[model samples]
Target: STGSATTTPIDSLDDAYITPVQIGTPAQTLNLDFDTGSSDLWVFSSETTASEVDGQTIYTPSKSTTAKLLSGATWSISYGDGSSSSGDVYTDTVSVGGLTVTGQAVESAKKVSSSFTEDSTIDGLLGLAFSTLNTVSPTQQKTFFDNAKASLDSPVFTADLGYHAPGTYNFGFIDTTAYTGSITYTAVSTKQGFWEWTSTGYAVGSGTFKSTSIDGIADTGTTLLYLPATVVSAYWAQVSGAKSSSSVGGYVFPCSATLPSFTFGVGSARIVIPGDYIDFGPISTGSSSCFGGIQSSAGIGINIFGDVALKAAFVVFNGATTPTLGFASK
Candidate 1:
């Protein structure tokens, strides 16, 4: 079986992307953030506090004949940014694009963080990372992709995230038409339940390509690119008037500054991120200082090649016995 879903950037800055997911029997569709960095398919539901929900849609399990409470089951998750959610669990028929899976765990959010409540664009999150990271108690539940992998023609998924546009998420089969050049495959380490891999090297603009191994995770859930302090400083130095400001948060430069492109290696293949992509957005609504899309992941402990980098290429999340990641220019 094969399935394809369109993901649309929620804002002009490409802060995040959301895909419509069909859950329950009559099929209540809600816009969910597809996160490859986390492992829990949770949603805002009727069980959620009324004050916690703004304009987002909520899933009503009682309305679905196919929904069944996972008695005694509960889940809780927290991100590095401090946003969190927790809830009771339900097993139901869930559908994404054309793919359908029965008995998929659907966590109903009973409580949500302030950030989640402020952002009304997304009603929930659909995790695509390894199921080992699932937060369900007693028995960790499998991700949607994991539950449907056996029925898929191929046990793999692809992310083609676009900049200020709509992209695609493919399950079961690769779309050859989505990318250019030969796909480069790299070994992945799932020990931490992330799409963790090491990049061969990197280069700034037309600068010399450094031969170094940089470990990072391909996280579609994140909005920016985060690297080691050394790498981040190197990239920021190329921009005039760029400064690392605690007040501004990370690196910020003059909005008018000419930014340099960033390139990273996947095996022998090089994927180039356009300079425009690095100029994330202004520090404020119309501030002259703009926040850089590339920042240091020093305190974070792990480097992240987020949407800023993923938008530069077509990415394949291979789910074989020994998982691997594939990258190709588009």
Candidate 2:
């Protein structure tokens, strides 16, 4: 069995919320989010002007006797939603759920938008995804995982997103109850930050793929599953009289019945996507229109397997050790 740990929410101090945990000593705490879409660690600080903040927590260095700031280092981040923030980098004694660590790198934003400033509940985001997407650079700085890996009781970090508002998101350990067997690790390519894989062709329902092979990438950042035009057509063919209809900016099909399941082979692992994913409602086109699992992205070089696929499995990121990824629980 792989190692496991559980995550709990901590109390909020002023506008900032923190989880107390063990670091190098009993003095460190960490602010984190349970986001699986993106990977990065960010915090707000005193350096940030009151005019630039909204619903999120802002860390005040003066509030903590152990908090320290890293001068001359500044950071700016942009999201897919076109929102952005700019701030200086700092370090201090932080804690997370009884764990304390000193000199952890923290970002202090000086300028923020109304969208982030107006919202007072969620102060900042602690990205718990993959490490390759981490904002920290080895040449300039080491990440939280980079520093904690050497001393952590377990080298692996697993997140158990149960049915709670703030679910048990674990670090430094894996929950054995989440799976029935050994964890299967897939070697990751260091070339790109995204998890890429080869597909053994496309299929409609329980049918087999004609060619049995194709290449693709996995991205948690994206919400939709994007595939090639040919693959989409092949999948649509499996549906009974499944015609393409324009809805929600994608192709939709008309079928109240259970569509056939499609399976894609990744290495020796075969992943099956349920037909309900194609049973999308027509927000714009019409009420009867349904979308197919595969969409047309003709000129694009790669297909993207997004959250729709990841939600079916337990994803373990081994960035705490090296850049490695593993999947469990189908």
Candidate 3:
């Protein structure tokens, strides 16, 4: 019940890598997105009607021998993209590969918003956020990771998120083969239930990497990178046909524009994002328009280093003692 597990990229939404997790006694399999930004293990369940949840699988706790409903328990969550889900609660055995956490809190979603319903392939969201952020009422619930941490070889998980390919999330141990060079670590500030850290600085195009500290979160569920408006504008200035469009709600540039690579400071080492990554493909299917993956992080003072940024490196999320983050070129 220690070791690690591997995850594959979802069929179409390569932005969100999916991992197979077993919930219940006999083990009902569900494709879940391991979201560090969220802290609830919620799934479409038998409580959700067929019409309400099409093209998705459900976790039926009643069918499992080890599943039990918790009295007077419910959970509701609203994500950054306005996606919301609410449901009842059950305690069951949840396992991911060799790691098993008995009596894990599982939220059964009775209702889900369009933001979630739009992506029918996702059966659930496996929260990797701190247990303090868990949504259960009365007595707070612990996450699968928290329950399994003591049994693990080390309280750590490494993310090897890929680009248009399959990736893996290793538990308890770090796999040196997945990355190149040495992994550089930085102290993480976990005040917001997020893997928040200061990226000493960032640079647009070929400009020198600035020394100004840009604080941000490492969000595996978010598809793009988000920085302050000023930082976004500086990057846009390097491109001739780029503009911040209300229609797109972000910066858009010509598809053919020779985009520049974006680099950010991580301790003393700077991880560079390729030019193609900066251009987040076409804005829409078959449309010549393209959107800048690095956009303005409005409202929130901090920025976000999302899946787009994670793809360029191998990341280690250390949960033992003081929170720390380690990044290496992949």
lDDT winner: 1
Q: What digit string (tens of lDDT, one per residue) describes model 1 on residues 1-330?
A: 888999999989999999999999899999999999999999999999999999999999999999999999999999878899999999999998899999999999999999999999999999999999999998899999999999999999999999889999999999999999889999999999999999999999999999899999999999999999999999999998999999977999999998999999998889999999998878889899999999999999999999999999999999988999999999
Please provide TM-scores, in order, for all candidate models, with all chains considered together.
0.99, 0.68, 0.96
User: Model 2, which residues run further than 4 Å from truth?
Assistant: 1-39, 44-52, 94-101, 112-122, 128-139, 160-168, 194-204, 209-221, 232-262, 273-304, 320-322
lDDT of 3 at 211: 85
Estimate candidate 1's alpha-carbon lDDT, on a 0 to 1 scale.
0.95
Against the true structure, candidate 1 reaches a TM-score of 0.99
Expressed as tens digits, the lDDT of each residue in 27-77 for candidate 3 is 899999998887899999999755678778899988999999988899988
Query: Which 10-residue window in model 2 sums to the lowest lDDT?
Result: 9-18
Winner on TM-score (2 vs 3) = 3
Please give the distance, in angstroms, between residue 40's alpha carbon in candidate 1 and its true position after superposition: 0.2
By TM-score, the best candidate is 1
Give the alpha carbon lDDT tens digit for every residue of 137-212 in model 2. 3324445554566666676555433211233444577677776555667665546555565555655676755655
Question: 1 or 2: which has the higher TM-score?
Answer: 1
lDDT computed for candidate 3: 0.85
The model with the greater TM-score, 1 or 3, is: 1
Badly placed stretches (over 4 Å) of model 3 are 11-13
